[PDB]
UniProtKB/Swiss-Prot annotation:
Chain's role: Methylates the carboxyl group of the C-terminal leucine residue of protein phosphatase 2A catalytic subunits to form alpha-leucine ester residues. Acts on the two major protein phosphatase 2A catalytic subunits, PPH21 and PPH22.
Tagged with keyword S-adenosyl-L-methionine: yes
Regulation of protein activity: Inhibited by S-adenosyl-L-homocysteine.
Any GO MF annotation of the entry: protein C-terminal leucine carboxyl O-methyltransferase activity
Entry binding sites for S-adenosyl-L-methionine: 73, 97, 120, 167-169, 193
EC annotation from Swiss-Prot or TrEMBL: 2.1.1.233
Native source organism of the sequence: Saccharomyces cerevisiae (strain ATCC 204508 / S288c)
Catalytic activity annotation: [phosphatase 2A protein]-C-terminal L-leucine + S-adenosyl-L-methionine = [phosphatase 2A protein]-C-terminal L-leucine methyl ester + S-adenosyl-L-homocysteine
Gene this protein is translated from: PPM1
Protein name in the entry: Leucine carboxyl methyltransferase 1
Organismal lineage: Eukaryota, Fungi, Dikarya, Ascomycota, Saccharomycotina
Tagged with keyword Glycoprotein: no
């Protein structure tokens, strides 16, 4: 999760984010997008010297190619969310594996009838609860008090926002949490940003079939990497070796779902499944005005190196009713 936060703060410091066109942010909410994430880094220092040390040095060692990958990852997920929230005013979002994601701050503001539900491991949501309650600007955005006033499973439960500890590998614990914070009939958006890659095939497939069957109308926006379908494409072999040799983590279903078609077949129950890798989103969805703006920030010397990386990431959008 500290990798994901290092990417977002490096993109904001250079200028890549916020993109007020694609994210549909106002003048005040564009300023607040920068001020909320900056106060998340300063407050993270107060609560952890080790976590601030890894996030600070990763920010400053960020390359232009990696900043283009964070831009497409953020405005890609945001473009799918905002199209669904405009067509449907009463919606509830369930951000599975949220981490340090702060997209609920501008989205709750922009949509009065929007509920939101951050869900992550116990350790991740305890640090996120400490940062939102400590900072003054993050407190005012969610209307929180400084103390831990919430009860039982929820660390936060103020108005139209809910932070909750939950083992997503456990399906019995996942459904029981969704019974108390969501309703069956209300349109839903399920975001799995960098979650299903770290899970085995049994835990991920049961999470997809159970949540889709729980709600009537919805839209699953899942972002993840793929191993690569071409022969002699060892991007998936390099990343699996880089994860264990670094901090002892795994990506069990990387080589299994090595293409955008195989990844999209997990949501085959849903009748409307689209899927496009992040290089296709760079050439199609991103306007010409936006690409000129990113060129003014940094020198993208190796555009082919950006294509090799971004074709090994995807954005799936399943929709059922």
């Amino acid at each position: 999760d500290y990798d994901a936060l290092s990417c977002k703060l490096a993109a904001i410091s250079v200028g890549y984010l916020p993109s007020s066109g694609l994210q549909r942010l106002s003048v005040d909410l564009s300023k607040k997008y920068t001020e909320w994430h900056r106060s998340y880094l300063i407050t993270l220092k107060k609560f952890s010297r080790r976590a601030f040390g890894k996030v600070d040095k990763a920010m400053r060692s960020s390359f232009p190619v990696m900043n283009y990958g964070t831009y497409l990852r953020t405005v890609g997920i945001d473009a799918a969310i905002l199209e669904f929230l405009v067509a449907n005013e009463k919606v509830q979002v369930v951000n599975l594996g949220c981490g340090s994601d702060l997209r609920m701050l501008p989205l709750l503001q922009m949509f009065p009838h929007l509920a939101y539900v951050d869900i992550d491991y116990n350790e991740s949501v305890e640090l996120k609860n400490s940062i939102l309650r400590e900072s003054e600007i993050l407190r005012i955005s969610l209307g929180l008090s400084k103390e831990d006033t919430a009860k039982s499973p929820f660390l936060i439960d103020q108005g139209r926002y809910k932070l909750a500890a939950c083992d997503l590998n456990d399906i019995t614990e996942t459904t029981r949490l969704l019974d108390v914070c969501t309703k069956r009939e209300i349109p839903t958006i399920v975001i799995s940003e960098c979650l299903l890659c770290y899970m085995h095939n049994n835990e991920s497939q049961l999470l997809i079939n159970t949540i889709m069957s729980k709600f009537s109308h919805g839209l699953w926006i899942s972002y993840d990497p793929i191993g690569g379908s071409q022969p002699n494409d060892r991007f998936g072999a390099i990343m699996q070796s880089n994860l264990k040799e670094s901090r002892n983590l795994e990506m069990p279903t990387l080589m299994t779902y090595n293409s955008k078609e195989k990844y999209a077949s997990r949501w085959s129950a849903a009748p409307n499944v689209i899927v496009n890798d992040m290089w296709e989103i760079f050439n199609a969805q991103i306007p010409e005005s936006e690409r000129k703006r990113l060129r003014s920030l940094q020198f993208l010397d190796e555009l082919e190196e950006l294509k090799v990386m971004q074709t090994h990431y995807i954005l799936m959008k399943a929709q059922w009713h």
